[PDB]
Amino acid sequence: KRYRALEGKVDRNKQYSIDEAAALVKELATAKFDETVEVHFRLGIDPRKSDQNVRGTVALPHGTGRSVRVAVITKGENVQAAEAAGADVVGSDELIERIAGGFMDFDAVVATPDMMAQIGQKLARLLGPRGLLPNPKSGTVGADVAGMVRGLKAGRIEFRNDKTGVVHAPIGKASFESGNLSANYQALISALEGAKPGTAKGVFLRSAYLTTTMGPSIPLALGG
RNA sequence: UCGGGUUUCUCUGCGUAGGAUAGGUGGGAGCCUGCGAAACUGGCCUUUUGGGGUCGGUGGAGGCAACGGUGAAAUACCAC
């Protein structure tokens, strides 16, 4: 159990908005190690059609307690511009053997302009239908594997949708401040309520709830 | 008796592989002694293919997830 002195201070009938929940989120987590509290939203527009899934990304503010994940595949003057920085698993053309041998937990596997065919002639039989490839309009295309892979540096990417009616993206950690849990919360209603491709209904935001390693939830308010 | 709603309580979810239905994210490695995990017999619920609960004989009480297995995710520990 262990449900008091952290839920006794919790009532699921009042409010705790932006400048208030931020000074009461790192609190409701007197459990074990570092404890992050989720930020819940509800995509319940119409959860059973192909044009209601948010097929886009989000970019976290500062620097989380994590790192940077990008398995580059390059050759030439792109190896010293991709190993002397801090990406992930970089070498040469043998990165088709590191992503077809027995491990695919890597992220945005980059390439080279004239070497896109390395992830299109050799890894379009396996890595083809994975939706994690470099193309000339989305993530990282061209010789931009040092400037806009910084969108994979300063911002936890993440792209997912479901079949029920719950969508909750993380802020990172609570190992910061009471003005930085609401600074990470200025990029979640700033990069997640913009999914309107084909058809939708009326009124989007309704309320908000929470989640930890021992809860709980004080319904977050909304406004200016 | 019927019409439904709301709220407390109650759980099915195998087109794929994956030993045993993972239902989702974060703390993804810890505590749990304070709120439905093992399968011998003519089963209800999923339908006499395997699988949570069983009514009772039958009678190892400490563990599991995982590296592996594995996939845009994994079978457990805490909640929405």
Technique behind the model: X-ray
The region that residue A197 occupies, defined by phi over 0 for left and psi between -120 and 50 for alpha, beta otherwise, is alpha
Give the Cα separation of A75 and A66 in Å (integer): 28
Q: CA A43 → CA A160, A166, A189, distances in Å?
A: 12, 6, 13
Q: Which nucleotides of strand B are protein-proximal, with an atom < 7 A from a CB? A: 13, 24-35, 69-73, 78-80
Shared-domain flag, residues A149 and A165: no
> What's the CATH code of the domain at A171?
3.30.190.20
Q: Domain count of chain A? A: 2
Among residues A104, A120, A155, which one ends one of the domains? A155
Provide the CA A41 to C1' B47 distance, Å, integer: 38
A180 — phi, psi (to 5°)? -115, -10
Domain that holds residue A21: 11-62+156-224
Strand B CB-contacts below 7 Å: A 1-2, 32-36, 38, 40, 102-105, 129-132, 158-162, 164, 166, 168, 170, 173, 209-217
Whether A139 and A165 map to the same domain: the answer is no
Contact indicator for A176, A73 with CB cutoff of 8 Å: no
